[PDB]
Write an enzyme that holds these catalytic residues in place. Structure first.
Site, PDB file in Angstrom:
ATOM      1  N   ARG A  31       0.861  -1.192   0.000  1.00  0.00           N
ATOM      2  CA  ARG A  31       0.000   0.000   0.000  1.00  0.00           C
ATOM      3  C   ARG A  31       0.891   1.234   0.000  1.00  0.00           C
ATOM      4  NH1 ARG A  31      -3.246  -1.652   3.707  1.00  0.00           N
ATOM      5  NH2 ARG A  31      -2.739  -0.385   5.547  1.00  0.00           N
ATOM      6  N   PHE A  68       1.333  10.564   2.036  1.00  0.00           N
ATOM      7  CA  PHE A  68       0.987   9.930   3.311  1.00  0.00           C
ATOM      8  C   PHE A  68       2.100   8.958   3.712  1.00  0.00           C
ATOM      9  CE2 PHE A  68      -2.542   7.181   5.604  1.00  0.00           C
ATOM     10  CZ  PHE A  68      -1.922   7.422   6.822  1.00  0.00           C
ATOM     11  N   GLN A 124       3.734   1.464   2.841  1.00  0.00           N
ATOM     12  CA  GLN A 124       3.685   0.379   3.817  1.00  0.00           C
ATOM     13  C   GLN A 124       4.128  -0.947   3.191  1.00  0.00           C
ATOM     14  OE1 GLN A 124       0.107   0.255   6.104  1.00  0.00           O
ATOM     15  NE2 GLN A 124       0.333  -1.895   6.764  1.00  0.00           N
ATOM     16  N   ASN A 127       0.369  -1.667  12.719  1.00  0.00           N
ATOM     17  CA  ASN A 127      -0.213  -2.588  13.689  1.00  0.00           C
ATOM     18  C   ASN A 127      -1.723  -2.660  13.531  1.00  0.00           C
ATOM     19  OD1 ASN A 127      -1.666  -0.673  15.528  1.00  0.00           O
ATOM     20  ND2 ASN A 127       0.434   0.112  15.965  1.00  0.00           N
ATOM     21  N   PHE A 137       5.917   1.159   8.058  1.00  0.00           N
ATOM     22  CA  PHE A 137       5.635   2.143   7.027  1.00  0.00           C
ATOM     23  C   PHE A 137       6.696   3.233   7.069  1.00  0.00           C
ATOM     24  CE2 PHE A 137       3.509   5.470   9.718  1.00  0.00           C
ATOM     25  CZ  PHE A 137       3.268   4.721  10.848  1.00  0.00           C
ATOM     26  N   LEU A 140      -0.715   9.764  14.277  1.00  0.00           N
ATOM     27  CA  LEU A 140      -0.287   8.424  14.634  1.00  0.00           C
ATOM     28  C   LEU A 140       0.602   8.399  15.869  1.00  0.00           C
ATOM     29  CD1 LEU A 140       0.461   7.050  11.030  1.00  0.00           C
ATOM     30  CD2 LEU A 140      -1.653   6.955  12.391  1.00  0.00           C
ATOM     31  N   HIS A 182       1.523   4.246  17.047  1.00  0.00           N
ATOM     32  CA  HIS A 182       2.479   3.498  16.236  1.00  0.00           C
ATOM     33  C   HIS A 182       3.880   3.787  16.751  1.00  0.00           C
ATOM     34  CE1 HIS A 182      -0.384   2.145  13.121  1.00  0.00           C
ATOM     35  NE2 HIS A 182      -1.055   3.199  13.545  1.00  0.00           N
TER      36      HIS A 182
HETATM   37  C1  LIG Z   1      -3.825   0.582  10.336  1.00  0.00           C
HETATM   38  C2  LIG Z   1      -2.725  -0.160   9.569  1.00  0.00           C
HETATM   39  N1  LIG Z   1      -2.727  -1.545  10.030  1.00  0.00           N
HETATM   40  C3  LIG Z   1      -2.553  -2.575   9.153  1.00  0.00           C
HETATM   41  O1  LIG Z   1      -2.355  -2.378   7.955  1.00  0.00           O
HETATM   42  C4  LIG Z   1      -2.672  -3.971   9.770  1.00  0.00           C
HETATM   43  C5  LIG Z   1      -1.467  -4.853   9.490  1.00  0.00           C
HETATM   44  C6  LIG Z   1      -1.427  -6.193  10.270  1.00  0.00           C
HETATM   45  C7  LIG Z   1      -0.425  -5.571  11.251  1.00  0.00           C
HETATM   46  C8  LIG Z   1      -0.208  -4.390  10.272  1.00  0.00           C
HETATM   47  O2  LIG Z   1      -3.795  -4.544   9.018  1.00  0.00           O
HETATM   48  C9  LIG Z   1      -5.040  -4.491   9.593  1.00  0.00           C
HETATM   49  O3  LIG Z   1      -5.278  -4.012  10.704  1.00  0.00           O
HETATM   50  C10 LIG Z   1      -6.126  -5.061   8.667  1.00  0.00           C
HETATM   51  C11 LIG Z   1      -5.760  -6.387   7.977  1.00  0.00           C
HETATM   52  C12 LIG Z   1      -7.430  -5.179   9.476  1.00  0.00           C
HETATM   53  C13 LIG Z   1      -6.130  -3.962   7.607  1.00  0.00           C
HETATM   54  C14 LIG Z   1      -6.400  -2.649   7.834  1.00  0.00           C
HETATM   55  C15 LIG Z   1      -6.360  -1.643   6.769  1.00  0.00           C
HETATM   56  C16 LIG Z   1      -6.593  -1.988   5.436  1.00  0.00           C
HETATM   57  C17 LIG Z   1      -6.556  -1.008   4.434  1.00  0.00           C
HETATM   58  C18 LIG Z   1      -6.275   0.340   4.760  1.00  0.00           C
HETATM   59  C19 LIG Z   1      -6.225   1.364   3.806  1.00  0.00           C
HETATM   60  C20 LIG Z   1      -5.893   2.678   4.169  1.00  0.00           C
HETATM   61  C21 LIG Z   1      -5.676   2.947   5.528  1.00  0.00           C
HETATM   62  N2  LIG Z   1      -5.791   1.975   6.483  1.00  0.00           N
HETATM   63  C22 LIG Z   1      -6.033   0.701   6.106  1.00  0.00           C
HETATM   64  C23 LIG Z   1      -6.082  -0.297   7.084  1.00  0.00           C
HETATM   65  C24 LIG Z   1      -5.280   4.316   6.041  1.00  0.00           C
HETATM   66  C25 LIG Z   1      -6.476   4.986   6.714  1.00  0.00           C
HETATM   67  N3  LIG Z   1      -4.174   4.083   7.026  1.00  0.00           N
HETATM   68  C26 LIG Z   1      -2.979   3.443   6.730  1.00  0.00           C
HETATM   69  O4  LIG Z   1      -2.692   3.032   5.615  1.00  0.00           O
HETATM   70  C27 LIG Z   1      -2.030   3.225   7.919  1.00  0.00           C
HETATM   71  C28 LIG Z   1      -0.697   3.984   7.843  1.00  0.00           C
HETATM   72  C29 LIG Z   1       0.128   3.659   9.082  1.00  0.00           C
HETATM   73  C30 LIG Z   1       0.377   2.145   9.020  1.00  0.00           C
HETATM   74  N4  LIG Z   1      -0.890   1.423   8.937  1.00  0.00           N
HETATM   75  N5  LIG Z   1      -1.746   1.766   7.852  1.00  0.00           N
HETATM   76  C31 LIG Z   1      -1.359   0.477   9.811  1.00  0.00           C
HETATM   77  O5  LIG Z   1      -0.687   0.122  10.793  1.00  0.00           O
END
Ligand SMILES: C[C@@H]1NC(=O)[C@H](C2CCC2)OC(=O)C(C)(C)/C=C/c2ccc3ccc(nc3c2)[C@@H](C)NC(=O)[C@@H]2CCCN(N2)C1=O
Length: 165
Positions: A56, A61, A64, A103, A114, A123, A127
């Site tokens: 992603r 932003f 990841q 997380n 990320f 965050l 985080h």
């Molecule tokens: C919160 C996210 N956590 C994960 O990705 C963990 C994984 C398992 C340990 C880490 O996956 C999950 O919780 C599930 C599998 C439930 C997926 C969640 C998910 C999916 C698509 C997204 C699309 C967009 C967004 N959030 C998204 C979040 C936007 C708003 N924010 C982000 O991209 C943030 C940036 C900081 C890092 N960062 N993402 C995280 O730490």
């Protein structure tokens, strides 16, 4: 006197070499979190980031990556077990280049991480920040151009090689 470790990722775009990004890991502030990312970058436990992708990338932003077990953001594991705790929140998300743990709630760190491409202060305190880009922010900015608003990448962005300097 201990010196903070430096690790590198060699990035590729649809298999084509792009450049190198290096990171300082703040072992002086978050030793357990730094050590996880260090060891996953060298592969020395028998698993880690080599060959994995950035699943992603949201321009303006963050980028990841680190899911080497399910390759889509749902997987990953740490050198301590499937998950480990939040170490502390001493360091904040101050701007582009910050390296921080992804997380799924409190105390769910694994291998996903990320790289900030903007300041992401909302965050802070949930985080764990554990490093920063040292050299190659130009390469992170080039990776960013293959992201999109919803984070899907238009070419496959991979860690072709990684290790410690
Ligand atoms: C919160 C996210 N956590 C994960 O990705 C963990 C994984 C398992 C340990 C880490 O996956 C999950 O919780 C599930 C599998 C439930 C997926 C969640 C998910 C999916 C698509 C997204 C699309 C967009 C967004 N959030 C998204 C979040 C936007 C708003 N924010 C982000 O991209 C943030 C940036 C900081 C890092 N960062 N993402 C995280 O730490």
């Amino acid at each position: 006197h201990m010196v903070n470790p430096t690790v590198f990722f060699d990035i590729a775009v649809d298999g084509e070499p792009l450049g190198r990004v290096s990171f300082e890991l703040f072992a002086d502030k978050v030793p357990k979190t730094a050590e996880n990312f260090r060891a996953l970058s060298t592969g020395e436990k028998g698993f880690g980031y080599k060959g994995s992708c950035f699943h992603r990338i949201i321009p303006g932003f963050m980028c990841q990556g680190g899911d080497f077990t399910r390759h889509n953001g749902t997987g990953g594991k740490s050198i301590y077990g499937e998950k480990f705790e939040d170490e502390n929140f001493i360091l904040k998300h101050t701007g582009p280049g910050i390296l921080s743990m992804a997380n799924a709630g409190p105390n769910t760190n694994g291998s996903q991480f990320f790289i900030c491409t903007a300041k992401t202060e909302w965050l802070d305190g949930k985080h764990v920040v554990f490093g920063k880009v040292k050299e190659g922010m130009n390469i992170v900015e080039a990776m960013e151009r293959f992201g999109s608003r919803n984070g899907k990448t238009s070419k496959k962005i991979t860690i072709a090689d990684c290790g410690q300097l």
